[PDB]
Design a protein around this ligand. Sequence first.
Ligand SMILES: Fc1ccc(-c2nc3n(c2-c2ccncc2)CCS3)cc1
Ligand SMILES: [Ca+2]
Ligand SMILES: [Ca+2]
Ligand SMILES: [Cl-]
Length: 422
Amino acid sequence: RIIVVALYDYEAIHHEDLSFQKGDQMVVLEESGEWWKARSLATRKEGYIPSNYVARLETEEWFFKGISRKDAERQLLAPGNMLGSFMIRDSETTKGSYSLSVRDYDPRQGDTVKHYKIRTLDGFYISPRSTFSTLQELVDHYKKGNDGLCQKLSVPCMSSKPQKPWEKDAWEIPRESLKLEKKLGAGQFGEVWMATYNKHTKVAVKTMKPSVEAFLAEANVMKTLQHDKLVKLHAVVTKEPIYIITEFMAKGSLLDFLKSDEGSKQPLPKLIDFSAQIAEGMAFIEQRNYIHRDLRAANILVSASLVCKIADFGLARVIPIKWTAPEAINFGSFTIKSDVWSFGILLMEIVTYGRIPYPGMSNPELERGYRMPRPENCPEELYNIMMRCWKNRPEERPTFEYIQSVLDDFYTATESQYEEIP
Ligand SMILES: Fc1ccc(-c2nc3n(c2-c2ccncc2)CCS3)cc1
Ligand SMILES: [Ca+2]
Ligand SMILES: [Ca+2]
Ligand SMILES: [Cl-]
């Protein structure tokens, strides 16, 4: 007898899925991954529901599960929030513990987010003097007054409806299910379309010009590489020409967005954030021991809410020298370090708002030790990161883990990560 509650509103759009509202209790009948079979207690109907839409602490309006410090910082500084906006989350360095992230303001620094460790007793407390038995007592307390905090607690961080999962057992789909509506891009190997799946789910389809099974297997490799900074691979059409179905990114490629009007209005910390998300994705690729082979702003997608994701890596294997490292050009040796070089070039693209890497220079001719000069708006240390990425010896290039760690806390000293309260 398992009972869960709905965290968000969900309207059914399939044959056997259920419609429920925020707060509706339900009885779990079967747990089958992204989709569970359950029975509503309000409608008494048995059907399918998305797992990530229900919980059995998560039910609290001020708790956010599985999110990092940087993620909290991003979601709190997002539009729709104010001073005092806060959240309680799973600690990222203290496994099993919790942390509080609060939005603050201060001149000369702008809008910020402070983070406080929450210590579990052997109850909870931020300050040893003021202790609480439940987290709800903590939040209720600090909503009354700072009491040591950077700011008085106000309203929980604005919750965002999660991504609707792909329908069950729909990895291989019939072509008739798709209506390719608007061509977004074309190339030598195929084209890219904005399309609709079964009249309900907007997706992006990549049509591949005409081995079948081997490519299919490569796609089966890609499908298991799921990450928030990697484009979600939903479905595939098997009959030629092969269609690759992925999630739709509203603002398209990072290149086009940076060259766009809205992109030119994006400040430097936002660019740093973009490249930090890209670095995180490439770090996920790095930990899994894989290779992108073609890292550029053109191969990075941007969601509607300004989220940068890595797209279509590994497709290159089934087949850009300015983004390519010397060790990969002269000897065809492609490794993660060449991806680091490529990431340096990408960094340069992002700071220069999509500008061509070596302007005025043709592909031929680096041997004289020439590196791109630092742009006027580019920070010296960021340029230092670029230079570290552009090193002749591949083994002397930084890891994507380290690069991500540096870019994430680019404006924060290590000591200033979590505020200390006596
Ligand atoms: F399977 C895939 C389908 C489309 C793409 C794709 N390739 C490019 N863009 C998109 C894309 C566009 C819009 N939404 C999502 C992806 C934009 C510039 S080049 C990649 C993989
Ligand atoms: Ca500086
Ligand atoms: Ca500290
Ligand atoms: Cl029942």
